[PDB]
Design a protein around this ligand. Structure first.
Ligand SMILES: CC(C)CCC[C@@H](C)[C@H]1CC[C@H]2[C@@H]3CC=C4C[C@@H](O)CC[C@]4(C)[C@H]3CC[C@]12C
Ligand SMILES: C[C@]12CC[C@H](O)C[C@H]1CC[C@@H]1[C@@H]2CC[C@]2(C)[C@@H](c3ccc(=O)oc3)CC[C@]12O
Ligand SMILES: *[C@@H]1O[C@H](CO)[C@@H](O)[C@H](O)[C@H]1NC(C)=O
Ligand SMILES: [K+]
Ligand SMILES: [K+]
Ligand SMILES: [K+]
Ligand SMILES: [Mg+2]
Lengths: 288, 32, 996
C-alpha cells in the first residue's frame, strides 16, 4: 500500500489524470470514427442485390429436416418422448410450407404439378419489382408430413427424413446429361429435375439393410428446375426452396446402419473433407 | 460461371512475388 | 558458518613478521642455516596440505544448462506454457479442438524457452571455452634447504617453516619471513600494488606485514638478487590465497538488465492478469460458465505474453557481444554487455591497469637544466640535445653500474617492449641507454668490471670500478649511484659541460630543489656520480678489494639526477576524458604510495588541473592541515592508514563531498569496502584492475573488468568482463555499447508489444460480440514467432539517435526499460490502430463474401457448430460447415497479413524514439531486409500450396492485401507528428506522456 495515495497524487500519479483521460477519450473517439468510416465505404462497395463473391458455396450442400447432434437419429417407436425433438424440428421446418401460409397471389405464383424448365425472372436489378415465388405444397411429400394425413408419427414405425438443397443465389442446377454414368434406379426425368439417391456405405462393403421410397415433385425423386434460380432475400423473401422426403421403410431395428445421400448433376460436386457438400450422411437406429 | 474463381493465377502471382521480394532483400543485405 | 568465514576474511591481516631469528626458529622448530630434516618436511607436508591454492570451489557441471532455462523471463514463458496445458486439461471436459490450439501453443512456448536456453548457454559456453584456452600453468620448483643440502623440489612439496633460497627470476613459492638477503628486490606489483620493486631485507621495517621488508609473498617474483627465508605460510594460508578464497566467496549482485527485465515482467504480468481477471468477471457476467470463463482467463493472460521477445532479446544481447568479441573485449556473461552504460562510477586500480606498470625514465638533470626524455612507447615524442659531454658521462655511469642485461631472445624486438633480466630501475636505465646513447653491451665491456658492490639495502649505494678505454688518460674509473641525499652526502666536485667544479650551496640547493621538484612530481629520483682514481696512488696492477675500503668514498664528482616512473597505457587519459565527459564518476583505488598515485591521477584526468586537496591549499596557505575547511577541497587523497579507522558515515561524507577521488596504500579488503561504499549510495559501480588485489572488488562490483594479459588469474576469474588486448579505451566503447542497446532494446520491446493488441482483440470481442473468430492460434504464432522476428532483431542494428556519450548515466530508479509510457504507446495508441485495421479486413472479407457485419453478431454459436450446414448469411444463402469455416480461415490469413502490413509502419516508427524517420534515415539494412522478408514470407504462408490443409491458411484475393494499408499509413503519420511535437516542444505534455 504505497502508490494508491501519495502527496499530491492518486495511484499512481494523479494530478494530471484529467489530461490523459480526456486525450484517450478524444483519440479513441477518432479511432472509432475512422474505423466506422472505412467500414462505411466498404459497405458502399457492397452490392445491395448479389454478394461480390459466391465461390466458397460453389458445390452446394445437402441438408436435412431433423438436423441431429451428429448426423444421428436414435429413437424408440413406442415412446412419444423419444421422437419428440426430431418431429418438432419437422413441424417448425414445414410450418412455412402450409397451404394457408402462402395465400397471396401477389407474391406467390402457382407453378407446375410437374417438374419444369428453370424460371428466369428478368435480371437481378430492382428495375423489375419484387419477384414472385413458386409455391411448394406439402402434399408433394406423401406419407411424409402428409399434410394432416398421417404419418403422423412422421415415421413413428419406420424412419423418414427430408432432403433439401442449399440456397445459392443465381444457382441454376444442371442435372446429369441424358448420357448418365451409373446413376442408380432413377426415373427418366433427367431433363427437368436434379436427382438424389441413397446407399448404405459409400464405395465400400456396406451393412446396407433397407428399402426406401422417395417423395419429390410429380413423383420423381428430386428438385424441379422451376424453383431456380433463387433470387435472394431482398428480391424473393418468402421463397420456398424445393424439398424431397426420403422414407426408409424396411430396416433392421436394434442395429445402427449408416446412410449416404447424393445429388447428381453437372452443377453438383462432392468433397471428401466436406461430407455435407454435394452429399449427405445419416446414422439411424430405431431401437425397441 | 460466377462460381469459379481462379486461385491458381493468384497463387502463382503471390509466389512469384515472394520469390522476388526475398531475393531482393538478399540483394539489400549484401551491399558489396 | 561461511558467513563468519567471510567476516574474518574481509579483515586485513596480521603477522609474526617482527621477531628475532632466535624466536622465529623457536616457534617454528627449525635450524636457520640447515632448515629442517627431510623427515620433518615429509611429516609437515602430510600434516596440513601441499603448497598450492585449492582449485576453484566452483566447476559447476554442464547441468548448469538448466540455469539458462529459468532466469526470470523463461519463467514467464514456462508459467505461460503451464497455463496452456492447464486450459487444455480443462478443455478435456468435452470433445474439443485444442489438439490444434492449446496443446500446440503450450508445446510451442516450451520450445521457445528451451531453444533460447540452448542458444545463450551455447554462446556463454563459447566464452568459457576461450577463457580456459588462455590458461597456461607452467610448474615452478622451489629451491629449499633441508638437512643442510640445497634441494630444488616441487613447490607443492614445500611446507611451513623450512628454509628457502630465491634468486633473480625465481617466483616466490610461499609466504616467507626473510632471515638473510643480498641485493634482493622483489616485485610486489600484482599483490600489494607497489609499482617500483620493493627491496627485501631481513630487518623489521613497517608495522604492516605487506609493506614491511622482511616478508616475501606467494606469487610475487624476485626481480633480482638472492635471499633466504623460513616459510611462514603455505597453500591457501598465504596472502594471495586468502585474497583468492575471499574472491570465490563473493556475489555479483543483480545485473541492472536483470532488474529491468524483471520490472518489465511485472508490467506484462500486471497487465495480463488484469485483463484476464477483469474479463473472467465480465465473461461470467454475461453467460459463460466457470469452466469456459476460466478458459478465457487463461487464454487472455497467455495471449498477453510475448514468446518472441525472449528469443529476440537473447539475440540482441548476443549481437552486441559479437561486436565486443570482435573488438577483443570478451564478456563472460551475456547480460553484462549492458552494465557499462548504466555505470555512474568506476573504481580503477592504478598499477598494471591505468599504467603500463613498466618503469621508464622520465626526466634527467644535466648541466643545471632538467631535460625530458621521450617516455612514449612508439617513440613519436621529442629527444632533447644529446650532444653535451655531461650527458655522455652520465649515460656511461648509468650503463656501467647495471646488473640488468638484455636476455638471449631480444634483438628484433623494439628496445622498449623487449624483455630484460634484472631490476626495474636497471631495466629502465639499460633500455634508455641502449636507445639514446647506442648499444650498452659495447660500452659495458669496454670498461672491464673489477670488483662491484651490489646495492646495500642501507644507504642504497651501488658502485663498481673499471679500467679506462680513453687513449689520453689511463686512470681508474669508479662509478656509483644511489639516494640523492646520500649521494649529496658523499661527494665534493660536480661536472658541468665536461669540466669539474666544487659544490657551492647555491647550486647545491639548486640540485636539492630540483630533486624535490622531480621527486614531488611523483617520479622517484636516483642520483648519479663518478670519480677517476689517482692512478699514482692506485697503479694499473693494484688490486682493490671489497674486503674493506680501498677507495675514497668522499670528495667524489656528482654528475646528475635521473628520475623515473611507470607511465599510463597510451589511450588511458583520453579514455578517462571520455568517461568524465559521459558523467561517470572516476575514482582511483590503489595499494601504491600516494606520492605517485596523486601525480598519476592528476595526469590521466582523475584529478583535473585546477583542483586541490586540503593539503595543497594548506601548502599554498602555509598553515596546519587541520586549519583548512575540507568542504572547500574538491579533490582528495585518502591514505590507507585512515581508511581502517574510518566508519561508514565518514566514508559516505568523503564520497559525497569530493568530486575527484583517490585512495592509496589500500588493501584489497579496503577496496571491496570502497566498492560496497559506492554501492550503498545506490549507484552502479564498475571496477577495472590488474592483479590479485583487485579480485574481491571486481567480483563484488555490478560488473568487473579485468585486463587479459597483464592481469592475474584470480582477478580474471572474479571479473565479468575481460579485455584481451588490454586496451583501456575499450572501456569507453563498453559504456558506449551498454548505453546504446538499452534504447534499442526498448525499441525492440515496444515493437513486439505493439503486435499484442491486434493479436489479442480477436479473442476478446469474440467472447463479447459473439462473432465468428477473426484471428486464430496458428496465424498469431505466424506473427509472433514467424514474421515480427526479423524486424525486431533488425531494431538492434539501429544507430544512435543523438550523441549518447553527452548524457549522464540513467537513473535506475526513475529511468526504466519498460515503463508506463511505453505500454501507454504499444497497447494504448498504435496497437489499437493495428487491431482496427485487422477488424476492417475481417469485415471487408466477410461482407464481400455475403455475411454483412450487422448480421455477423451472435453468429459464433451457430457458426462454430459443426452440424448446422444450413446457415443463413445476409443474402439468404446457405453454408455448410467447411464452406463457412474456410471463409473463416481465409479470414484468419488476411488478418495475419494485416498484422504484417501494420507492423511495417510500426517497425519504421519504433526505429526512432525521438528524431523523425527522415532524420535517422532508412540506413539500417537489416531493417530493410526485415521488411522484404517479413512480407515475402507472409505472402508465402497465404499463397503456398497445401497451406490451407497444413496451416489452415488459404490464399487471398489480392484486394485483401490493400485493406490494411490506410491504417499503417495512419500509424506512420501519427507517430511522425508525435515525434515532431516532442522535438519542437520538449516541455512537454507529449513528452511526459508518450516518450519512452
Ligand atoms: C511499405 C509498403 C508500401 C511496401 C509495398 C509492397 C506492396 C505494394 C506489395 C507487398 C505485398 C504485395 C502482394 C503479395 C501478394 C500478391 C498476389 C498477387 O497475385 C497479386 C498481387 C499481390 C496482392 C501483391 C501486391 C503488391 C504487395 C501488396
Ligand atoms: C482454443 C480457444 C479456446 C477458447 C475459445 O473456445 C476460443 C478458441 C480459439 C482461440 C484460442 C482459444 C484458446 C486460447 C488461445 C490460444 C489464446 C492465445 C492466443 C495467442 C497467444 O499467443 O496465446 C494465447 C487466446 C485465444 C486462443 O487463440
Ligand atoms: C403410405 O402409408 C399407407 C398406410 O400407412 C400405405 O398403404 C402406403 O403404401 C404408403 N405409401 C407410401 C408411398 O409410403
Ligand atoms: K502472445
Ligand atoms: K562479479
Ligand atoms: K507480441
Ligand atoms: Mg595494479
Amino acid at each position: 500500500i504505497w502508490n494508491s495515495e501519495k502527496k499530491e497524487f492518486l495511484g499512481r500519479t494523479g494530478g494530471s489524470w484529467f489530461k490523459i483521460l480526456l486525450f484517450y477519450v478524444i483519440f479513441y473517439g477518432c479511432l472509432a470514427g475512422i474505423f466506422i468510416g472505412t467500414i462505411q465505404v466498404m459497405l458502399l462497395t457492397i452490392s445491395e442485390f448479389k454478394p461480390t463473391y459466391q465461390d466458397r458455396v460453389a458445390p452446394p450442400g445437402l441438408t436435412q429436416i431433423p438436423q441431429s447432434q451428429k448426423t444421428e437419429i436414435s429413437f424408440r417407436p413406442n415412446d412419444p418422448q423419444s421422437y419428440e425433438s426430431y418431429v418438432v424440428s419437422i413441424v417448425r421446418f414445414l410450418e412455412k410450407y402450409k397451404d394457408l401460409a402462402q395465400k397471396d397471389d401477389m407474391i406467390f405464383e402457382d407453378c407446375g404439378n410437374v417438374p419444369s424448365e428453370l424460371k428466369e425472372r428478368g435480371e437481378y436489378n430492382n428495375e423489375r419489382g419484387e419477384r414472385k415465388v413458386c409455391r411448394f405444397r406439402l402434399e408433394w411429400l406423401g406419407n411424409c408430413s402428409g399434410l394432416n394425413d398421417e404419418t403422423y408419427g412422421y415415421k413413428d414405425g419406420k424412419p423418414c427424413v427430408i432432403i433439401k438443397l442449399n440456397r445459392v443465389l443465381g444457382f441454376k442446377p444442371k442435372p446429369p446429361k441424358n448420357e448418365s454414368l451409373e446413376t442408380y434406379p432413377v426415373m427418366k426425368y433427367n431433363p427437368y429435375v436434379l436427382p438424389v439417391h441413397c446407399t448404405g456405405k459409400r464405395d465400400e462393403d456396406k451393412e446396407k439393410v433397407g428399402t426406401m421410397e422417395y417423395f419429390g415433385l410429380g413423383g420423381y425423386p428430386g428438385f424441379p428446375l422451376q424453383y431456380y434460380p433463387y433470387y435472394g432475400k431482398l428480391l424473393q423473401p418468402k421463397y420456398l426452396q424445393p424439398l424431397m422426403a426420403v422414407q426408409f421403410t424396411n430396416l433392421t431395428m436394434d442395429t445402427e446402419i449408416r446412410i449416404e445421400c447424393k445429388a447428381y448433376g453437372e452443377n453438383i460436386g462432392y468433397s471428401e473433407k466436406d461430407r455435407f457438400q454435394g452429399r449427405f450422411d445419416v446414422k439411424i437406429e430405431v431401437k425397441s | 460461371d460466377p462460381f469459379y474463381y481462379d486461385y491458381e493465377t493468384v497463387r502463382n502471382g503471390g509466389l512469384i512475388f515472394a520469390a522476388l521480394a526475398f531475393i531482393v532483400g538478399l540483394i539489400i543485405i549484401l551491399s558489396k | 558458518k561461511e558467513r563468519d568465514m567471510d567476516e574474518l576474511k574481509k579483515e586485513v591481516s596480521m603477522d609474526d613478521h617482527k621477531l628475532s631469528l632466535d624466536e622465529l626458529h623457536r616457534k617454528y622448530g627449525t635450524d636457520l642455516s640447515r632448515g629442517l630434516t627431510p623427515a620433518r618436511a615429509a611429516e609437515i607436508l602430510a600434516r596440513d596440505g601441499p603448497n598450492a591454492l585449492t582449485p576453484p570451489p566452483t566447476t559447476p557441471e554442464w547441468v548448469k544448462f538448466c540455469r539458462q532455462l529459468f532466469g526470470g523471463f523463461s519463467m514467464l514463458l514456462w508459467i505461460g506454457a503451464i497455463l496452456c496445458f492447464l486450459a487444455y486439461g480443462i478443455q478435456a471436459a468435452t470433445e474439443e479442438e485444442p489438439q490444434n490450439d492449446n496443446l500446440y501453443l503450450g508445446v510451442v512456448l516450451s520450445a521457445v524457452v528451451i531453444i533460447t536456453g540452448c542458444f545463450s548457454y551455447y554462446q556463454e559456453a563459447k566464452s568459457s571455452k576461450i577463457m580456459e584456452s588462455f590458461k597456461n600453468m607452467v610448474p615452478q620448483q622451489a629451491l629449499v634447504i633441508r638437512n643442510g643440502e640445497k634441494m630444488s623440489i616441487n613447490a607443492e612439496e614445500v611446507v611451513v617453516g623450512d628454509l628457502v633460497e630465491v634468486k633473480g627470476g625465481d617466483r616466490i613459492p610461499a609466504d616467507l619471513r626473510i632471515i638473510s638477503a643480498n641485493g634482493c628486490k622483489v616485485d610486489n606489483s600484482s599483490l600489494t600494488g607497489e609499482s617500483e620493486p620493493q627491496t627485501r631485507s631481513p630487518d623489521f621495517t613497517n608495522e604492516n606485514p605487506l609493506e614491511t621488508r622482511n616478508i616475501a609473498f606467494f606469487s610475487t617474483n624476485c626481480v633480482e638478487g638472492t635471499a633466504r627465508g623460513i616459510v611462514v605460510y603455505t597453500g591457501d594460508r598465504t596472502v594471495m590465497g586468502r585474497i583468492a578464497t575471499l574472491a570465490s566467496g563473493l556475489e555479483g549482485g543483480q545485473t541492472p538488465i536483470a532488474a529491468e527485465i524483471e520490472h518489465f515482467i511485472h508490467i506484462i504480468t500486471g497487465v495480463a492478469v488484469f485483463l484476464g481477471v477483469s474479463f473472467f468477471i465480465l465473461s461470467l457476467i454475461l453467460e459463460y460458465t466457470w469452466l469456459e470463463a476460466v478458459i478465457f482467463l487463461i487464454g487472455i493472460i497467455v495471449a498477453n505474453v510475448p514468446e518472441g521477445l525472449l528469443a529476440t532479446v537473447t539475440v540482441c544481447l548476443t549481437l552486441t557481444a559479437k561486436r565486443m568479441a570482435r573488438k577483443n573485449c570478451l564478456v563472460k556473461n551475456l547480460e553484462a554487455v549492458e552494465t557499462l552504460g548504466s555505470t555512474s562510477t568506476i573504481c580503477s586500480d592504478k598499477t598494471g591497469t591505468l599504467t603500463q606498470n613498466r618503469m621508464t625514465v622520465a626526466h634527467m638533470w644535466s648541466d643545471n637544466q632538467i631535460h625530458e626524455a621521450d617516455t612514449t612507447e612508439n617513440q613519436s615524442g621529442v629527444s632533447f640535445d644529446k650532444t653535451s659531454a655531461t650527458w655522455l658521462a652520465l649515460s656511461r655511469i648509468a650503463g656501467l653500474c647495471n646488473r640488468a642485461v638484455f636476455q638471449a631472445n631480444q634483438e628484433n624486438l623494439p628496445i622498449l617492449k623487449r624483455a630484460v633480466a634484472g631490476d626495474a630501475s636497471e631495466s629502465a636505465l639499460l633500455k634508455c641507454i641502449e636507445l639514446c646513447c647506442g648499444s650498452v653491451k659495447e660500452m659495458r665491456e669496454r670498461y672491464t668490471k673489477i670488483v662491484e658492490i651490489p646495492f646495500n639495502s642501507t644507504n642504497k649505494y651501488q658502485l663498481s670500478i673499471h679500467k679506462n678505454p680513453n687513449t689520453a688518460e689511463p686512470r681508474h674509473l669508479l662509478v656509483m649511484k644511489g639516494a640523492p641525499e646520500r649521494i649529496l652526502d658523499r661527494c665534493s666536485s660536480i661536472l658541468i659541460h665536461g669540466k669539474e667544479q666544487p659544490l657551492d650551496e647555491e647550486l647545491k640547493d639548486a640540485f636539492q630543489n630540483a630533486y624535490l621538484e622531480l621527486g614531488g612530481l611523483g617520479e622517484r629520483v636516483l642520483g648519479f656520480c663518478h670519480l677517476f682514481l689517482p692512478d699514482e696512488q692506485f697503479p694499473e696492477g693494484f688490486q682493490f678489494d671489497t674486503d674493506d675500503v680501498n677507495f675514497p668514498l668522499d670528495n667524489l664528482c656528482f654528475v646528475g639526477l635521473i628520475s623515473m616512473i611507470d607511465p599510463p597505457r597510451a589511450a588511458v587519459p583520453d579514455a578517462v576524458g571520455k568517461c568524465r565527459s559521459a558523467g561517470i564518476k572516476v575514482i582511483m583505488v590503489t595499494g601504491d604510495h600516494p606520492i605517485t598515485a596523486k601525480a598519476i591521477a592528476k595526469g590521466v584526468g582523475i584529478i583535473s588541473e585546477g583542483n586541490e586537496t586540503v593539503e595543497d591549499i594548506a601548502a599554498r596557505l602555509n598553515i596546519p592541515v587541520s586549519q583548512v575547511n575540507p568542504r572547500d577541497a574538491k579533490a582528495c587523497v585518502v591514505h590507507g592508514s585512515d581508511l581502517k579507522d574510518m566508519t561508514s558515515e565518514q566514508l559516505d561524507d568523503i564520497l559525497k563531498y569530493h568530486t575527484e577521488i583517490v585512495f592509496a596504500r589500500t588493501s584489497p579488503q579496503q577496496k571491496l569496502i570502497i566498492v560496497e561504499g559506492c554501492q550503498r549510495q545506490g549507484a552502479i559501480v564498475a571496477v577495472t584492475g590488474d592483479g590479485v588485489n583487485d579480485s574481491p572488488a571486481s567480483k563484488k562490483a555490478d560488473i568487473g573488468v579485468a585486463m587479459g594479459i597483464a592481469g592475474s588469474d584470480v582477478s580474471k576469474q572474479a571479473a565479468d568482463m575481460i579485455l584481451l588486448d588490454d586496451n583501456f579505451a575499450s572501456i569507453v566503447t563498453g559504456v558506449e555499447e551498454g548505453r546504446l542497446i538499452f534504447d534499442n532494446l526498448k525499441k525492440s520491446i515496444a515493437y513486439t508489444l505493439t503486435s499484442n493488441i491486434p493479436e489479442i482483440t480477436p479473442f476478446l470481442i469474440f467472447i463479447i460480440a459473439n462473432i465468428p473468430l477473426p484471428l486464430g492460434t496458428v496465424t498469431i504464432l505466424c506473427i509472433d514467432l514467424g514474421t515480427d522476428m526479423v524486424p525486431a532483431i533488425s531494431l538492434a542494428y539501429e544507430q544512435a539517435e543523438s550523441d549518447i556519450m553527452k548524457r549522464q548515466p540513467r537513473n535506475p530508479k526513475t529511468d526504466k526499460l519498460v515503463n508506463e509510457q511505453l505500454i501507454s504507446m504499444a497497447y494504448g495508441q498504435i496497437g489499437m490502430i493495428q487491431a482496427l485495421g485487422g477488424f476492417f479486413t475481417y469485415f471487408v472479407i466477410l461482407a464481400e463474401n455475403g455475411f454483412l457485419p450487422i448480421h455477423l453478431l451472435g453468429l459464433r454459436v451457430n457458426w462454430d457448430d459443426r452440424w448446422i450446414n444450413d446457415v443463413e448469411d445476409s443474402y439468404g444463402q446457405q453454408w455448410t460447415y467447411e464452406q463457412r469455416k474456410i471463409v473463416e480461415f481465409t479470414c484468419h490469413t488476411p488478418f495475419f497479413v494485416t498484422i504484417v502490413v501494420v507492423q511495417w509502419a510500426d517497425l519504421v516508427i519504433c526505429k526512432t524514439r525521438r528524431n523523425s524517420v527522415f532524420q535517422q534515415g532508412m540506413k539500417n539494412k537489416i531493417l530493410i531486409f526485415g521488411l522484404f522478408e517479413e512480407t515475402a514470407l507472409a505472402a508465402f504462408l497465404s499463397y503456398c500450396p497445401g497451406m490451407g490443409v497444413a496451416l489452415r491458411m488459404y490464399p487471398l484475393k489480392p484486394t485483401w492485401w490493400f485493406c490494411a494499408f490506410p491504417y499503417s499509413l495512419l500509424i506512420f503519420v501519427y507517430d511522425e507528428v508525435r515525434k515532431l511535437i516532442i522535438r519542437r516542444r520538449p516541455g512537454g505534455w507529449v513528452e511526459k506522456e508518450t516518450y519512452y
